[PDB]
Design an enzyme around this catalytic site. Sequence first.
Site, short mmCIF file in Angstrom:
data_model
loop_
_atom_site.label_atom_id
_atom_site.label_comp_id
_atom_site.label_asym_id
_atom_site.label_seq_id
_atom_site.Cartn_x
_atom_site.Cartn_y
_atom_site.Cartn_z
N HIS A 178 1.65 2.39 3.22
CA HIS A 178 1.64 2.24 1.80
C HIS A 178 1.36 3.94 1.14
O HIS A 178 0.04 4.26 0.94
CB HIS A 178 0.47 1.52 1.54
CG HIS A 178 0.66 0.87 0.07
ND1 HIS A 178 -0.22 -0.16 -0.47
CD2 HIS A 178 0.91 1.59 -1.16
CE1 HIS A 178 0.12 -0.24 -1.90
NE2 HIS A 178 0.80 0.84 -2.48
N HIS B 100 2.99 6.21 -1.75
CA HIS B 100 4.12 6.38 -2.81
C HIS B 100 4.62 7.86 -2.65
O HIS B 100 3.85 8.86 -2.39
CB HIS B 100 3.18 6.52 -4.09
CG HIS B 100 2.70 5.10 -4.39
ND1 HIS B 100 3.37 4.57 -5.54
CD2 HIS B 100 1.90 4.47 -4.06
CE1 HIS B 100 2.66 3.28 -5.74
NE2 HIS B 100 1.79 3.14 -4.66
N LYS C 22 9.89 -3.64 -0.92
CA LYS C 22 8.65 -3.75 -1.52
C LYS C 22 8.84 -4.69 -2.91
O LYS C 22 9.43 -4.31 -3.87
CB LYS C 22 8.12 -2.56 -1.92
CG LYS C 22 6.86 -2.43 -2.92
CD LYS C 22 5.53 -2.86 -2.20
CE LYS C 22 4.40 -2.84 -3.19
NZ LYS C 22 3.97 -1.28 -3.39
N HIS D 134 6.69 -5.22 -6.21
CA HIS D 134 5.86 -5.25 -6.77
C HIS D 134 6.03 -5.82 -8.44
O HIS D 134 6.98 -5.89 -8.77
CB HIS D 134 5.88 -3.30 -7.16
CG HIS D 134 4.47 -2.76 -7.49
ND1 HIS D 134 3.99 -3.07 -8.82
CD2 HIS D 134 3.80 -2.11 -6.92
CE1 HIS D 134 2.79 -2.25 -8.70
NE2 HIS D 134 2.70 -1.93 -7.77
N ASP E 65 5.01 -4.75 -11.24
CA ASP E 65 5.62 -3.82 -12.26
C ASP E 65 7.19 -3.87 -12.36
O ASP E 65 7.84 -3.80 -13.55
CB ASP E 65 5.22 -2.51 -11.88
CG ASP E 65 3.88 -2.16 -12.49
OD1 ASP E 65 3.09 -2.96 -12.22
OD2 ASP E 65 3.50 -1.18 -13.06
N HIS F 18 3.29 -6.50 -3.83
CA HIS F 18 2.17 -6.24 -4.76
C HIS F 18 2.13 -7.41 -5.81
O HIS F 18 3.16 -7.55 -6.57
CB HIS F 18 2.35 -5.01 -5.36
CG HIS F 18 1.27 -4.63 -6.42
ND1 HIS F 18 0.42 -3.62 -6.49
CD2 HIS F 18 0.88 -5.44 -7.49
CE1 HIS F 18 -0.30 -3.41 -7.20
NE2 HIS F 18 -0.04 -4.56 -7.93
N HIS G 43 -2.81 -4.08 -0.12
CA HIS G 43 -4.21 -4.15 -0.64
C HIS G 43 -4.66 -5.58 -1.32
O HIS G 43 -4.79 -5.84 -2.28
CB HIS G 43 -4.26 -3.19 -2.04
CG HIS G 43 -3.08 -3.17 -3.19
ND1 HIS G 43 -2.49 -4.39 -3.34
CD2 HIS G 43 -2.17 -2.62 -3.35
CE1 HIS G 43 -1.60 -4.18 -4.18
NE2 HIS G 43 -1.15 -3.10 -4.33
N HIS H 19 -3.84 1.89 -16.99
CA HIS H 19 -3.09 1.21 -17.94
C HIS H 19 -3.40 1.42 -19.37
O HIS H 19 -3.38 0.47 -20.26
CB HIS H 19 -3.37 -0.42 -17.41
CG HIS H 19 -2.83 -0.47 -16.07
ND1 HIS H 19 -3.58 -0.43 -15.11
CD2 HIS H 19 -1.75 -1.03 -15.53
CE1 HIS H 19 -3.03 -0.64 -13.95
NE2 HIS H 19 -2.03 -1.27 -14.18
N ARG I 279 -11.21 -7.59 -12.81
CA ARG I 279 -10.41 -6.98 -11.83
C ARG I 279 -11.13 -6.19 -10.84
O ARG I 279 -10.56 -6.17 -9.89
CB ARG I 279 -9.24 -6.23 -12.49
CG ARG I 279 -7.79 -6.86 -12.45
CD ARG I 279 -7.27 -6.98 -11.30
NE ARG I 279 -7.05 -5.58 -10.64
CZ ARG I 279 -6.31 -4.77 -11.34
NH1 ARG I 279 -5.24 -5.14 -12.15
NH2 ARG I 279 -6.12 -3.47 -10.86
N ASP J 233 -2.06 3.71 -0.09
CA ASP J 233 -1.70 3.72 -1.60
C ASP J 233 -1.84 5.19 -1.93
O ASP J 233 -2.49 5.60 -3.14
CB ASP J 233 -2.63 2.62 -2.41
CG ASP J 233 -1.69 2.22 -3.62
OD1 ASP J 233 -0.51 2.63 -3.59
OD2 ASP J 233 -1.94 1.34 -4.01
#
Lengths: 101, 101, 101, 598, 299, 114, 114
Positions: E41, E43, E123, E125, E127, E152, E178, E226, E242, E266
């Site tokens: 994982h 980025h 992947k 995700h 988003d 995700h 995760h 966010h 969360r 991550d």
Amino acid sequence: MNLSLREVQKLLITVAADVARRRLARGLKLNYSEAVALITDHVMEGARDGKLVADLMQSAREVLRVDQVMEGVDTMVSIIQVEVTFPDGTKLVSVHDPIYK
Amino acid sequence: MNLSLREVQKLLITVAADVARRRLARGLKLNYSEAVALITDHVMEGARDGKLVADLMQSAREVLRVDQVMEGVDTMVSIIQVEVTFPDGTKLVSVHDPIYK
Amino acid sequence: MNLSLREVQKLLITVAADVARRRLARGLKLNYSEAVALITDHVMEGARDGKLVADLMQSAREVLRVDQVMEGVDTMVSIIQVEVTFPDGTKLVSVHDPIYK
Amino acid sequence: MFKISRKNYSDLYGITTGDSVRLGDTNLWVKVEKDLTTYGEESVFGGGKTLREGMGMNSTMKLDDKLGNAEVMDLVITNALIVDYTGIYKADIGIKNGKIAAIGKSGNPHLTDNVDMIVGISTEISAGEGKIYTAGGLDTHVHWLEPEIVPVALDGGITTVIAGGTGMNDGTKATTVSPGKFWVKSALQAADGLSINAGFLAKGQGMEDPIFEQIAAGACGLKIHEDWGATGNAIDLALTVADKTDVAVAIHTDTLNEAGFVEHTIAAMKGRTIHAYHTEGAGGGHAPDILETVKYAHILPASTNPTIPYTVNTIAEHLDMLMVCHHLNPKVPEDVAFADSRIRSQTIAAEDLLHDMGAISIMSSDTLAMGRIGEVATRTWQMAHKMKAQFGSLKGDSEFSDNNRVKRYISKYTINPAIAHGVDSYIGSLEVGKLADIVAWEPKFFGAKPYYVVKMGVIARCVAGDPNASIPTCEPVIMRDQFGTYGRLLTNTSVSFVSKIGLENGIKEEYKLEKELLPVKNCRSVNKKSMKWNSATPNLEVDPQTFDAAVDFNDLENWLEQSASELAKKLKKTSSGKYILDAEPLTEAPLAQRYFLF
Amino acid sequence: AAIGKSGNPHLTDNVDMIVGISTEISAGEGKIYTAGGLDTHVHWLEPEIVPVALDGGITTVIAGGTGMNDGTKATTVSPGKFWVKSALQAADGLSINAGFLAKGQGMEDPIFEQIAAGACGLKIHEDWGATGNAIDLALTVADKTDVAVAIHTDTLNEAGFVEHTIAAMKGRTIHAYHTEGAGGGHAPDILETVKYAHILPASTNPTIPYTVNTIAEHLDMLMVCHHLNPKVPEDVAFADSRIRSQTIAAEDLLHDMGAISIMSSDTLAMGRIGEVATRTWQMAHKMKAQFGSLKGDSE
Amino acid sequence: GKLVPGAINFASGEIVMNEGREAKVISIKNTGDRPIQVGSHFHLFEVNSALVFFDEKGNEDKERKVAYGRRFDIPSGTAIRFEPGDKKEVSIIDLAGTREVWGVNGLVNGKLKK
Amino acid sequence: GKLVPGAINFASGEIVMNEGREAKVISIKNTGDRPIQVGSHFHLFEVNSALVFFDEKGNEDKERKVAYGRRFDIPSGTAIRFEPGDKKEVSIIDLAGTREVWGVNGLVNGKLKK
Ligand code: NI
Ligand code: NI
Ligand code: NI
Ligand code: NI
């Protein structure tokens, strides 16, 4: 901080001048590299203070005396040049024969 | 300054030892890297002063006591080695078990 | 020392914050980079001391006042973020609007 | 249908039509002239946001598919505030195959009306909301001295250099000259492993055959420097070869007046287009009337940044420079006279006003010989700040709109240098069909520190923090080399500019170059009127005795918001009906000690 | 080539590997040797993650991204042929083993053409939209192409709950990124993926040591990431539900039992690439301090 | 006044989003035991099955005929949150373009029925 | 004495430059309004037209026959400066080699006339 490369590499002068400053406080006679770094840091911090370029070309010649450096170092440091960010922008400061008298 | 690469990279020791010294002043028990950096800086400045190699190998063992470092750090620092410019040229200094008593 | 890359690169913060601290001691109003470096160094040293993350998020806002920085710098520093080795491992500290009142 | 306040709108997507944002800490404002989006259909990327499968992101079309004239992009920059010579406006930027493919509205045509570029499965998103986007700068006066000028140039928003030199040799320390096939080949081979667009200039001296073979070796132009001899023969013969090969010519004119005055240099040109390096003349050029080149139609006048902000420290700094540069002993009268007649506050101050008028078209640096490669953009806007403070708004500008001045000044280091060296079809502006060389700025950092620099759709250098951190914004936050500088991506995201004859000679295979080579073109057909917003040719005269620089009364027309008659009451008058260009030196500058450590 | 006894068979018995003239020697006496770690994982944001990862014992990354772009800042996705090729070309000049993941959304052909460009997996995700169609079609393409899928999952429960995602999987193997759910995933019951046989559950290191500083750090992490203003009730409700100390604490015990199989980082989105091993052993420390020796272990 | 680098000066007047797109007021109720949050451009016909729609007259719509081909009339990129047991009034508008929905939950995967 | 790193010890005697090159004493006058400076190896026949030459007897030479194929008898790399209205006595010597001038002002571009 958003440090550009030219800002990052100038931190080398700060550390080297810090080494020279401590050694001078111990009574050591400064060598070529220590003397150049110490004089450069005076110019850099002076420009940050807002001094004129003309002032720094003269005041950087009183940082070190001949008796504060090793034999022959005063003849080795013919000129020191560094560019700093003045209030009016980046300017070049050239010091001629800084180690005299 | 006309700094060679080794001179430039040795300023890392100066900065790390400054960090270690400031943390020691606050009463913190030093970790492995801080202790190594502080002992190395002591050796480097002593070599600049003009001490003999044997004198530094013996005196770097009194920079830090066992109670001034975290538990197990004294057994972790088995040896510290660094080369410095003595008056007679570059020489190697090795400190064996610097953190004792 | 056995320094990893992140440890080595974090010494830049130490050097820049030393520069900022010396300039503040002279009565100079700090710019953006100097203020950011000084606050980051405060956070890093507090984390080394053993403070909680929340304590550092709250106490990094008292390092610099609005009158100690150049005009507009306080609005420029919206957030400062840095990760340090707390007693329980690496943690992130974020300071929101550190330069107020 | 509903309504939203402008403050809440800008929080979501950035400012829109009618709003203004301050450029850095200067006195300049840019106003959004138009918005290419549809209100309520803005493209935003994030968790539970517009650009998702089937909602804002098209899910059926492939990367090579088309729906009408719209295509699926490799990268889309949403809600970008474009600042360009074409305009100041809000739009999405679409990048495909390393080039700007579309400027307009992005999204999914299945759900949204009037989609010009399609966000598809093979599309990456960069959120440009709240940031200003400009084309990468061009530095056309660079001494090829050390490789670290490349990261410094990128830190200044410069994506392309037109350089010349051989490394740290004394010939390069004085002139931007890559002499001969070897040093042109060496320059192209070294540039092959640097993340910058580069073209190189050869030695413009001698007979036709020695000059021509340098261009056949791949040089994209010629530099005539007085240190190599800027004589009548050199000017004539260099221009003759350049017209045969369609390459540019730059000149460092004879400062000593050894073979003629400035009029002798102009006559040798015979109307052929030339690039006048540092036409003010502080660091070199016909003493003292080299500034008069701004009146000729066949001359593209350029200035170097050391003198561009006229400040309190300029004269003292520059006076000492020559005493070191040419070993001038301040004990022999000849050395002092040569320097006291060479650093003139009259021409240095008048140079700034000519830039505001548009008489000087190109901004440059003179890298590591007299000026600073990382400060081309910074000193350009510092000069723009000074002119507004001392002369008010430019003609057509208003309280919160300096758009006319901003477009004029941004052209000096983006499009005008591109046109001068014939690479404007590839770079120099944010337009469809050009290379995706884009610089992003946070408005509080505009003109001082860029947010990221994109080279053909790939980030090459950007602000970034601790690589071990949980987020990419952790101290130490510094400008770092990115993936565009590694592997084959390094040779994929930048180009080398060469002459057409050199490219046809197969220099790429001979020199074993891995980068793409793009030929320069249309170098001979451009003149002063080709420059955007900087095509003025006032009747500038430099007094041989007092060094004063004066223009005609009509030359002050259409310059500023205040009429020429009002300006005539402030500028000094000569014996004739001319008006002396002058202004007090700047004391405090923006884009300055508020930003830079040291 | 071999693991056993080295030397000269001419003078020594039972030699499995021969030290010869063309042989170099590394003295490993008194040192521990392990296989290079894998970080699945990552980025793909800045190149200097490579020297950091090697400084943490990581020799291989399964990453995704385009550099310092917002899409990469949010997700591990190299979208399309251009970005997969760019990732491979950049990795060509880095000293690490690397594979890359593409965008697992859309119809069959747009997903497949990414794999045809060389992507080793997909992947999914949220988003980009972690919907049922995305899961189904990405899994179909992966089964057709023999590549892995990481997810995700939908944190907002916008198109369904966690059971909807599990049903959309249809028994096909997936890699649950995760799975504890601090940084993303079906709120709040994504951890239940550790009960399914067709799921490979993975954790990211930011939460893997449950420590005194975890909760405040992660709460501020969410308020920053966010743009959660701590003045509107919706943002605070979405954040407080969360970051749960319950699931963060239970994750370590699940790791100790073997319910969670994979450790990851991550990188530069929520976790640290240089600490994957470190925190892992820290977890192994904490469990031993709190629950004693694992079954079969001694003093 | 105070020099703020990168300061913003706003124009006079408000901004009209989705001009010319008449909106309908409906109700949405979360019947599940976990929170749901729906974005601006999500096809409302394909949202979590725990959401229950109520038409413009307040009557329950079991087949979601009011949600077919429509999205929330809210700023692009924002979302609406429904806690368990919560019932909110919302504003919806028809989708635009060629009016095809592909993906989401795979309930349409083609042109919306006219 | 004092230890000077990189010190120079000089030999005894002067250095004779351009030995065997007999020099001619002439005068040059600058008639322009801007300064002119001419290098050591510049072909004096092709200098700025504002310079006016005077032969060894002091009489003006409009066609520069005294400057043809000759350069200054000064150290290589140096120069002589002429302020406006100034008239200096200078020393000149014939060029050497194959005696061809190519370039400069293009006035010869070939072998010098014998
Ligand atoms: Ni020049
Ligand atoms: Ni130059
Ligand atoms: Ni994730
Ligand atoms: Ni991630």
